[PDB]
Structure 1
């Protein structure tokens, strides 16, 4: 049975880039709901799978992907941020970025665009294509998880649902984007990245 992971920091450990109220609601309410509903959906599915009830299985897919995705996406997002974040990555990760996107700067401009380009709710991602052996940027709608729906390995995600910035940045998503770069835990992204090299 899935559970809500604790934050590697305090609700206000990302200020002023992301005020405490956001982190609090985002973690304790939003993520909590996705976890809670994920467990319920899984149980219902197990029961449906046991009876060989295809219609019931299919009818549960939306709730599974949404809440399951929500759980996956936010769990990663918490580790992608840190009071000790900011700046630029070093070593291989940095070399890969310049390699695949030209420069760290162009990389940012690309991920920012993918993130700002989401119409409605969704996420912007920097992932790893194991097949092509290189980095790849992609956007996902609502809570659709990167790996489950694209196959790409999530390295860094940027939540662009309005609940991720509205209380502080209101309608100006671009400001949120520019600010979040200050709390990116490149240490964790590098770990996720290095895990792909193999």
Structure 2
């Protein structure tokens, strides 16, 4: 069944950008809760789809999306962060330049749309295999990113930043680039491009 993945670092290792208390709650309470609930829902969905209990299958969809999306998004998020993440691979940098002009333009554009999310959500850098281009997008709540492979996500649910940054979401979104795990992001890019 689905399990809570261990973080690739210790709870305080992203300080001073994201605090120990945030990492601890975000992992041990929020992500844990999505996993526990997803397992209950997924079992129920398997039951209903097998038995052709259609009204119940349809009813279980929003909870599967929310908790499943929560599990997907946070699992990617933890791999996307590092105390010293390094720099983008030459192939990823070259592609960032091609599709956004520069890393600066990408960071600005993604930070801006992510900051602008109304309510809870996530910003994403992804790769679209069909049209062979990097794209940026936002998603409401825990809706998984669709139509492109995720590379780097920024959680802008208030629980992601509030204990440290309070209302100042922009400072958190700008600061998270300091701990972007470019090694991992580059690996995801390579994989999406095979």
Same fold (TM over 0.5): yes
| Equivalent position of 1:65 in the other structure | 65
| Equivalent position of 1:23 in the other structure | 23
Write the mapping of 1:112-191 to structure 2, written as runs, cut at 5 A: 112-146=111-145, 150-191=146-187
Q: Distance in 2 between matches of 1:85 and 1:197?
A: 21
Deviation of 1:107 (Å): 0.4
| Equivalent position of 2:56 in the other structure | 56
Write the mapping of 1:78-89 to structure 2, written as runs, cut at 5 A: 78-85=78-85, 88-89=87-88
Structure 2 length-normalised TM: 0.98
Residues 155-187 of structure 1 deviation map (CA, whole Å, 9 limit, x = unaligned): 000000000000000000001011111110000
Please list every run of at least 4 consecutive aligned residues from structure 1 whose deviation after the TM superposition is greater than 3 angstroms.
Answer: none
Give the unaligned 5+ runs of structure 1.
none
Q: Distance in 2 between matches of 1:108 and 1:131?
A: 23
Q: Distance in 2 between matches of 1:170 and 1:102?
A: 33
Deviation of 1:196 (Å): 1.5
Structure 1 length-normalised TM: 0.96
Q: Secondary structure at the match of 2:139?
A: strand
Deviation of 1:85 (Å): 1.8
Q: Distance in 2 between matches of 1:192 and 1:23?
A: 23
Deviation of 1:142 (Å): 0.1
Deviation of 1:90 (Å): 3.1
Give the unaligned 5+ runs of structure 2.
none
Deviation of 1:51 (Å): 1.3
Tell me whether 72-81 or 45-54 shows the greater mean CA deviation.
Answer: 45-54
Q: Distance in 1 between matches of 2:190 and 2:55?
A: 41
Residues 48-90 of structure 1 deviation map (CA, whole Å, 9 limit, x = unaligned): 112101100000000000000000000000000011226x413
Q: Distance in 2 between matches of 1:117 and 1:16?
A: 24
Q: Distance in 1 between matches of 2:39 and 2:25?
A: 20
Question: How many residues are paired up?
Answer: 194
Q: Distance in 1 between matches of 2:103 and 2:179?
A: 16
RMSD: 0.8
Deviation of 1:39 (Å): 0.3
